Amino acid sequence: APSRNGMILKPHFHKDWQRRVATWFNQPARKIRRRKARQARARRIAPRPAAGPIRPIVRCPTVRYHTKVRAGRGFSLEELRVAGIHKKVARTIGISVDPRRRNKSTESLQANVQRLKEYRSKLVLFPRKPSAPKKGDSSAEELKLATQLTGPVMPIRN
Amino acid sequence: SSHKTFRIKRFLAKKQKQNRPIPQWIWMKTGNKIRYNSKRRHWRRTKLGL
Amino acid sequence: HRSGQGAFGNMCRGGRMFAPTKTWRRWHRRVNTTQKRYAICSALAASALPALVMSKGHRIEEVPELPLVVEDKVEGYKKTKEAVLLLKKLKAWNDIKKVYASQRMRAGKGKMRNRRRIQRRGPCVIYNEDNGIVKAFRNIPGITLLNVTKLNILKLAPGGHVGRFCIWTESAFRKLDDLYGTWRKAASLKSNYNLP
Amino acid sequence: MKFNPFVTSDRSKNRKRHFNAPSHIRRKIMSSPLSKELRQKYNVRSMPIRKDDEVQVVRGHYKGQQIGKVVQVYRKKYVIYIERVQREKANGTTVHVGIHPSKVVITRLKLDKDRKKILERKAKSRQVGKEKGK
Amino acid sequence: PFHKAIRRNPDTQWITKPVHKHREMRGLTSAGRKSRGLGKGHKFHHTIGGSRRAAWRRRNTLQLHRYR
Amino acid sequence: QTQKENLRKFYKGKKYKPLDLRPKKTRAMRRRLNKHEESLKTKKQQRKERLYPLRKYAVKA
Amino acid sequence: SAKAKRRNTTGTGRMRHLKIVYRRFRHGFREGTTPKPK
RNA sequence: GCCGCCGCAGGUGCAGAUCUUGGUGGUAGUAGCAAAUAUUCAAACGAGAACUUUGAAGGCCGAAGUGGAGAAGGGUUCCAU
RNA sequence: CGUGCGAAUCGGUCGUCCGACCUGGGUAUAGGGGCGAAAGACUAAUCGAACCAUCUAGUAGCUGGUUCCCUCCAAAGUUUCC
RNA sequence: CGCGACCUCAGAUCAGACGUGGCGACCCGCUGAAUUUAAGCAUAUUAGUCAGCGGAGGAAAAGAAACUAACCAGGAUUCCCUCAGUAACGGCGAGUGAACAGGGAAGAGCCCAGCGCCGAAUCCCCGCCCCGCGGCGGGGCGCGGGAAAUGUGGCGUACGGAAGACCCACUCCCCGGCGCCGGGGGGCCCAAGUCCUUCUGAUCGAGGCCCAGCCCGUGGACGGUGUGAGGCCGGUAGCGGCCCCCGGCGCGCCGGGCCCGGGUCUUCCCGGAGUCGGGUUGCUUGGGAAUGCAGCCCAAAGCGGGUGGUAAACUCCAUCUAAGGCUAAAUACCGGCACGAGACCGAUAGUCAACAAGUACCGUAAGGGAAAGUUGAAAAGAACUUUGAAGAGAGAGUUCAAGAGGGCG
């Protein structure tokens, strides 16, 4: 007995959906598991921050959303060439490096070079051995002033 | 079968030892839930499966 | 013995019961945030309303005059005998003696389902920071210790009965003015909420 | 209060662990408190029971100040049999009446090296628990 | 897999793993991947996720939340 | 027991031994590689670990 | 044959090797050691 | 071990469905203990003998038997107390 | 007899009985298939398509039933279509 | 005929290593029917559906571009949300039906064929002795042999690499034992009343315990104890106490292999085949002048080729280069190993099975499949007399009561 004027739909319940049932039982359990995994990772990497490697400034496609700034994968080859630091040396100090990304914007090129200069100014490098320092190391005061930055390091703001 | 076997004969020999009921000392103890032997067999009643 | 019994159906022996229970039933109910705001509100004005305390059944005669706020040295106590001495100096012992007296037994199926012992709910106490107050007050039942900002509606209204008395501290009594404030001024610690 | 989730707090599970238990656990369950003088002297709250130990009846009908020796220990019902606790069957003989070991005051313990080891362990635990509190 | 000259080589230690037993039976080799048909492009929207069966399972299921 | 400890003390020094004296365990723990074979790293991997190891670093506040 | 699966299960028989496999797994697979004597 | 009161929740209200299981009646001390000839006396262990024991008499099956032995099948069904 | 001794027995009673005679054991032929001196005849007390389990809680404009109280309001067997 | 080898193919109780199969909740690759919906029914839908075959793991699948894409662009994989049930498919009817976009768990990269530089400059097995190993590890000796030039060791993978020349400055790279330096597992024990009056069956019951409103509380969770116990006991609390064992992480020691780099100019080198693709025919998808696979035929191009959601001709530009491969991360668990919890049920209910339950039992078989709790706190289970062959009665005894009499709430 169909009723009066109203909306119409296609209720996809003709199949045996009681066989394939996957409801959300472990939402807070998965949240506590991710929390404990993140705390275990933060206790694993002691000098390293929670975010780790920094992310470049990324322009957007899809002209509905072209007035945004994203955080992509890593820095580009021309960016590392203008920065001057070799990529195999910069990978060891925790910098996201990928040769696949393109470069079609001099403004974001200069912005990523400025981001790398800010990371170089904020960089604190530890010695290889705590008993004996080496040549390319920082002062002893910065080793004590260095700590875990809780949060994303140098966040992108509009 | 008048021509008797070897393995089924030992099976029947084990059933003849299982045929005997419970003793008298088993219910004299503390824990006595068994009143009598339930798993019994009779040669006219039970035809031994098969 | 089971031969032509027909055990299927709800009317027969076993088989299935009518309307089997659902794991995908909507057990939980979501609540809007602004409704939780008004649920947290309208509590202190009713707990101070002294008639609701007598309607609940607490001994209100022992407190002469205070919506009870004690000094900051309460968290410094770490002994149950010091807690009993503080309750005797504040004279609030009859409300917990009523809890020790009312030790009736539950009538139902909850006796074999780990819900046997029941008792009377006492007054709540709100602390600000831990200084050994939990290690002292975890043994004595009835007195529930809560946080200043983190409050629950279920503990403020046990069983839909508003009137349960709440003991505060000096730091919490100063922190409530920083949290809520007044009608025209919004919350400083929170983002934006005005009093109605 | 309890704050350990491994601790069993189920009524049927405690009633299962009370009855169903092997012999060394049943022997440790069967215990009795000491007297007021011996408790103050040894600083021991409670000790297990033995066939050689002496037993007085504390509560019940046939109570008094009679020093009774344990006849034999029956751990299936968690019971002992006291020497001067019995009643007459109608045929003429006498049958001892079993008394639960919780209603037992201790007048004398049969001291052995293994018994003195348990006394020294309980006294050391009592002294450590008193020193950590005071 | 049990020969010593193959076993000592670290370049073939992934071949002798117990996870990779019977690759040719499941069809995870080159011919097994070419017989199904998959790759990269906008025309391939049926191997997203794990595989065709996993994508079909993620399509034809429902998700019921806690508070709804 | 005494004959078995005498036999294992006799055959401990020799390389070859019967299958009963060899340790019986689960299949996934039997069919493995050797401990030195798990430590056999390739020359190019050792060259990469020699040239560029992971450094210890941090950032300022 | 749903009832034929539950007629002849693995839990019906001995599991004389399986129970000592679990009893060695709960220890951690020690291979022929000796306990400490007096 | 249980009741009332303030809110909430249900596997919450039975007379039937040739409804399910279980229990009990009129019937009813009814119908029945009829396929194939046949039994009768003395004593006896035993409290107790139309049915069992021995002693006697009279018969049946009539060698294609109401006889003795086998195979399949049954599995202590054979004997003693 | 026909709520049997019997989920197909017995009495009177026959056709045939040196040859198209019955048959004891082992083996071959199994289900849109087999066998069949041809009767949808038979195939384990079931044969116009054998037994058991699953889809299956298949379909049913069709029958059978569907449980506390009190108060107020208060119906149609038709226009047209398939 | 006679003498020595290369290739094809031979048999094992030759030394030594593998597979067989029970089970499998999750997963991978294939075959994959109709009851039904379309009030009939064949196209469609149910439906890559049950079922069947093969296979290992605590996960598998999975992964670094012949990508999304016409934007001011991003750049390995995975799950969730919006997208929206949106475009579309469909007797355009019923019905079926994705992602690009953005935000979070996530971060690990690369290596081979070819190309060429260096005296196969490359390694295995067996024996001797020495150190040692319930993962026989390394070296010393071996015209003792075999393999491999039909191609082995490093450099070496698309982001360019290498060599020559020119400047700079550097000393650590991992592994095996020894001794120090402070998370886990198995155990063992730790407080306060049996204080007074009284009741019955015992009290765990009622009253009081002062001016100390009896006592302890980093212990009033839980259970038993002749009725409803914080103080009778087991145990509870403790980053508390005691014993044993393992590894993790920071320092010293010798021992094994181990001397290998950044910038500028010039020259050579460079790509993976009967594979793409075209004609024809089925399967399947939302995929629709074809999204992909497969059966037959043809089958290349190397400023070469795939795609640019409309087929075919004339063109400009944007994308990386299928035809070689590895890789943990968030993802699933209905069976098993250890537990905890519950607004679930309470002996015809709950797993069919709370007990010697797939047990007894039935069928020639694949198979089917039950009925079943509440003595007394404590057996103190009835001694003694009589009737009677014994069964079965009539007086006594226990206990608070037989008003609890061996199938006894």
XYZ file of C-alpha atoms (C1' of nucleotides) in Angstrom, chain I residues 4 6 10 19 21 47 59 65 70 73 75 82:
12
model
C -4.370 -60.198 12.205
C 1.355 -60.856 9.282
C -3.967 -69.085 5.992
C 13.856 -78.396 -20.147
C 13.289 -75.429 -14.577
C 9.680 -44.662 -7.963
C 7.028 -18.225 -3.379
C -4.982 -18.071 15.040
C -12.402 2.665 31.440
C -16.143 10.093 18.339
C -17.873 3.853 8.476
C -5.430 -2.026 -15.647
